[PDB]
Design a protein around this ligand. Structure first.
Ligand SMILES: OC[C@H]1O[C@H](OC[C@H]2O[C@H](O[C@]3(CO)O[C@H](CO)[C@@H](O)[C@@H]3O)[C@H](O)[C@@H](O)[C@@H]2O)[C@H](O)[C@@H](O)[C@H]1O
Ligand SMILES: [Ca+2]
Length: 440
């Protein structure tokens, strides 16, 4: 195939930028801080469950919501013995509290019957509830977005919404049920990959990784959007053999393209790179949270990785910041190892772009601890704050199903300083486990 260059009018995680990361990540500015294992507790209210991917109830701008005097955190939880047991639980604390022990458990958001009662063809085939976001509406409602995963339909993933009805008293919160529970988006083929395209490849045994998940709600000027983990479609730079010849995915220069493309073509990562077409996608919603418009991706990762997770985006001090979590084990970049775990970050003057890499390369956070390390963390999430130059980084701590006595839990939070197009971890800024805000 002949070399070409096509950006599709979107931003790209380039091979050249990613290659700079192995050397750059040695700087403590970009490193998840060391945690103290003897301070680490299981979520007392979770009662023997693994609790991993979590997200706070947020105001439209991403700041932590105050629901009737409480903070609310939604989290994936399930049986450590069953990797396919994943449901969304709702945890809550009184505003002002910081202890991990302050987090009470309201239980599952959903009843098993809810997906059937929803009168929603896709939802009644759901087998697992995967990550998303939650916004606190202007009329005081808890508005959840999450991933409908269907194990029965070859791992179909559908962006889904529901309103969570919650009674509040001086002592407790209680989930009464849900309403407006509906599928929003399952891909369109042209802009974002759908499950049929995955099945076209031969699903799981093809080596392809189909994703359409981790939706993050955000507003700008009263317009409503979800930014989410996805993969490109046929019209915005699809996976395939031809993709390795697109200079937009390499960057730097034709000299670098020539050298890097030929190396990749001769490597054992050729097929992996061909299949890699991860994207951070965007859709606009209507005021009833239905689909208004499929939009172009904010960024894509063709050749680099098929998996850029937990999309997060917010405006802070005049600039827009876009983050994603990603595993080095799924990348094709020399120098990046199977131990390496990242939060990558991008910056723009506008929500819809264009986005340029945060610390020249995209590196914001690096974690490389052994999967066996009790203080291992993943799923790092930047929580925007009402004021100041710091965001709070949350993550989950222990690997799922690894230890009988130590479950996946809220990691100790820490501070990330953000100014202009640069970030640095704040020295000795470790907070409580699952702490959402600096202010108390
Ligand atoms: O697709 C095959 C893969 O499926 C399952 O893992 C899916 C996915 O899980 C994690 O992604 C996040 C971030 O932590 O976790 C939830 C799901 O639990 C997702 O909404 C979110 O993106 C991992 O980080 C990913 O690497 C992984 O692909 C299953 O658990 C795997 O064993 C495997 O079968
Ligand atoms: Ca792919």
């Amino acid at each position: 195939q002949k070399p070409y260059k096509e950006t599709y009018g979107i931003s790209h995680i380039t091979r050249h930028d990613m290659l700079q990361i192995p050397e750059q990540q040695k700087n403590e500015k970009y490193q998840v801080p060391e945690f103290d294992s003897s301070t680490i507790k299981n979520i007392s209210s979770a009662k023997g469950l693994d609790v991993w991917d979590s997200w706070p109830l947020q105001n439209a701008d991403g700041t932590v919501a105050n629901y009737h005097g409480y903070h609310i955190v939604f989290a994936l939880a399930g049986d450590p013995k069953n990797a396919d047991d994943t449901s969304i639980y709702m945890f809550y604390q009184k505003v002002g509290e910081t202890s991990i022990d302050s987090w009470k458990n309201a239980g599952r958001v959903f009843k098993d019957s809810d997906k059937f009662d929803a009168n929603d063809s896709i939802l009644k085939d759901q087998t697992q509830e995967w990550s998303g976001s939650a916004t606190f509406t202007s009329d005081g409602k808890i508005r959840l977005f999450y991933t409908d995963f269907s194990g029965k339909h070859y791992g179909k993933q559908t962006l889904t919404t529901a309103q969570v009805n919650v009674s509040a008293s001086d002592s407790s919160l209680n989930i009464n049920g849900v309403e407006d529970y509906k599928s929003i988006f399952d891909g369109d083929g042209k802009t974002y990959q759908n499950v049929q395209q995955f099945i076209d490849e031969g699903n799981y045994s093809s080596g392809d990784n189909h994703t359409l998940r981790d939706p993050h709600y955000v507003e700008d000027k009263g317009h409503k959007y979800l930014v989410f983990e996805a993969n490109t479609g046929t019209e915005d730079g699809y996976q395939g053999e031809e993709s390795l010849f697109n200079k937009a995915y390499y960057g730097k220069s034709t000299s670098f393209f020539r050298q890097e493309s030929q190396k990749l073509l001769q490597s054992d990562k050729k097929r992996t790179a061909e299949l890699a077409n991860g994207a951070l996608g965007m859709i606009e919603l209507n005021d009833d949270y239905t689909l208004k418009k499929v939009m172009k991706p904010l960024i894509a990762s063709n050749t680099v990785t098929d998996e850029i997770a937990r999309a997060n985006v917010f405006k802070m001090n005049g600039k827009w910041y876009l983050f994603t979590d990603s595993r080095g084990s799924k990348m094709t970049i020399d120098g990046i190892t199977s131990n390496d775990i990242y939060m990558l970050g991008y910056v723009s003057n506008s929500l819809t772009g264009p986005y340029k890499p945060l610390n020249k390369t995209g590196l914001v956070l690096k974690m490389d601890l052994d999967p066996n390390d009790v203080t291992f963390t993943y799923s790092h999430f930047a929580v925007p704050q009402a004021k100041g130059n710091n965001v709070v980084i949350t993550s989950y701590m222990t690997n799922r199903g690894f230890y009988a006595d130590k479950q996946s839990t809220f990691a100790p939070s820490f501070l990330l300083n953000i100014k202009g197009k640069k970030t640095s971890v704040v020295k000795d800024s470790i907070l409580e486990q699952g702490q959402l805000t600096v202010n108390k």
